[PDB]
Amino acid sequence: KFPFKPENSKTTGTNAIPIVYGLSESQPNSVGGSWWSSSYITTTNNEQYVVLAHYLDNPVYTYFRASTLNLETNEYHQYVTVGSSTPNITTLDVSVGNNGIKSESEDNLSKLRSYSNHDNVTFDITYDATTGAVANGGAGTFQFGEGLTWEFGLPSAKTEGSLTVHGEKLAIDPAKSHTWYDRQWGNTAAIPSNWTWFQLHIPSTEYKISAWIFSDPFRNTETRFATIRGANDETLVLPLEFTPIYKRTYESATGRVTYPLDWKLKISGFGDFKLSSYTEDQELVGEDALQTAYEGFITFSGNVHSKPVQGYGLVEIVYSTWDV
Numbered sequence: 276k277f278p279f280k281p282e283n284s285k286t287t288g289t290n291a292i293p294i295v296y297g298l299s300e301s302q303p304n305s306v307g308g309s310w311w312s313s314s315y316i317t318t319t320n321n322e323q324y325v326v327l328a329h330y331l332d333n334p335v336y337t338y339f340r341a342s343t344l345n346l347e348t349n350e351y352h353q354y355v356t357v358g359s360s361t362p363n364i365t366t367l368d369v370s371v372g373n374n375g376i377k378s379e380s381e382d383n384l385s386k387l388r389s390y391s392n393h394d395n396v397t398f399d400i401t402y403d404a405t406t407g408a409v410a411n412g413g414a415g416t417f418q419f420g421e422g423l424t425w426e427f428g429l430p431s432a433k434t435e436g437s438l439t440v441h442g443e444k445l446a447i448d449p450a451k452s453h454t455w456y457d458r459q460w461g462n463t464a465a466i467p468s469n470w471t472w473f474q475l476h477i478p479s480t481e482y483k484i485s486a487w488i489f490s491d492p493f494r495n496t497e498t499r500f501a502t503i504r505g506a507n508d509e510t511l512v513l514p515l516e517f518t519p520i521y522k523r524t525y526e527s528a529t530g531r532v533t534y535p536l537d538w539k540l541k542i543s544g545f546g547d548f549k550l551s552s553y554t555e556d557q558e559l560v561g562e563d564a565l566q567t568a569y570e571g572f573i574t575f576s577g578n579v580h581s582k583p584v585q586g587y588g589l590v591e592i593v594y595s596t597w598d599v
């Protein structure tokens with residue numbers, strides 16, 4: 276079994292690093308953008324799952340998408356459901372139909388909820404941001420496409436609730452579960468053509484890694500870097516070398532792209548990692564490029580400062596257009 280477990284720390288730690296926003300104020304619908312969660316779950320009957328929930332606001336449409344992965348059997352279910360608009364309100368409550376992400380707390384941190392009521396993808400997961408934030412870029416912002424993005428991750432939030440599998444409602448064990456909640460919003464429609472994002476956990480340590488790889492055709496540079504949150508709020512912003520490996524592949528159901536299923540990362544001054552997708556099919560299938568993503572549970576080995584490590588996490592592979 277994977278050693279899923281929550282942290283029990285303060286969300287912004289010492290507040291000694293002057294990040295460029297307040298977390299709570301960044302959560303409401305009015306801020307726009309993307310709300311995302313990946314829950315690493317052990318149930319009370321000792322089954323393990325990875326559950327994804329994601330709402331995106333976009334000028335053309337909205338969508339909610341979600342998936343479940345059974346870590347014992349590789350059974351995987353996903354859907355994408357398209358909406359038209361996001362209510363412009365001062366609280367967090369985003370949905371398409373009876374599926375969405377909402378805050379159940381005045382601070383938008385102590386209780387958040389990802390829920391889905393779709394055939395073969397039904398769950399109701401709450402989480403509490405008892406976990407030190409990953410402030411991407413060091414202070415929470417970095418260049419993303421033609422302009423800026425703002426992004427923070429809450430890596431190991433205490434998680435409760437249920438997921439329903441084959442008619443059986445299973446209860447989440449909060450001692451052996453955690454949720455990475457990722458909040459991201461931007462100021463430009465011209466986002467990168469495509470990217471890979473890694474979310475990494477190293478259970479022997481407090482390291483939480485949020486790594487981005489994509490091309491910047493506006494500056495004509497390559498973006499390839501990790502933000503690593505360590506202990507005591509310490510944050511590393513490090514270049515990396517990215518190698519996608521196509522010995523194993525998954526062809527998209529859209530017919531438009533072939534995903535690699537293994538990777539190498541060399542994070543400058545920190546370590547190197549060999550990462551592998553847990554199972555082939557982990558694709559959220561949309562009607563266009565932006566609605567589609569490879570969102571896959573991964574495991575990895577490697578070293579950190581020349582000491583061997585292993586861990587798990589998630590890889591996201593997104594094309595905002597198939598004409599890159």
Ligand SMILES: *[C@@H]1O[C@H](CO)[C@@H](O[C@@H]2O[C@H](CO)[C@@H](O[C@@H]3O[C@H](CO[C@H]4O[C@H](CO[C@H]5O[C@H](CO)[C@@H](O)[C@H](O)[C@@H]5O[C@H]5O[C@H](CO)[C@@H](O)[C@H](O)[C@@H]5O)[C@@H](O)[C@H](O[C@H]5O[C@H](CO)[C@@H](O)[C@H](O)[C@@H]5O)[C@@H]4O)[C@@H](O)[C@H](O)[C@@H]3O)[C@H](O)[C@H]2NC(C)=O)[C@H](O)[C@H]1NC(C)=O
Pocket residue numbers: 469470471488489490519599
């Ligand atoms: C974001 O998404 C991109 C796209 O999926 C990912 O990039 C790819 O990564 C893989 C793995 O690393 C690369 O595969 C390698 O490709 C080697 C060959 O590279 C050279 O050829 C490429 C193909 O060129 C042809 O096709 C493209 C369209 O697919 C045309 O634009 C191009 O003009 C060529 O067209 C002719 O051939 C096709 C048939 O293939 C016919 O249909 C046409 O009619 C033409 O006759 C080309 O894309 C490569 O360019 C890339 O790299 C150079 C640097 O060398 C850079 O200058 C370019 O701007 C571009 O980035 C290159 O010329 C091959 O030898 C090797 O074995 C392996 O297969 C793949 O090339 C990458 N593609 C691109 C566009 O970058 C990327 O990883 C992903 N990012 C993240 C973070 O996930």
Ligand SMILES: *[C@@H]1O[C@H](CO)[C@@H](O)[C@H](O)[C@H]1NC(C)=O
Pocket residue numbers: 305307363364
């Ligand atoms: C939401 O409404 C407020 C107040 O009415 C307005 O100032 C703001 O521009 C709106 N936000 C968006 C994204 O339209």
Ligand SMILES: [Mg+2]
Pocket residue numbers: 337338358359360361370371372
């Ligand atoms: Mg909607």
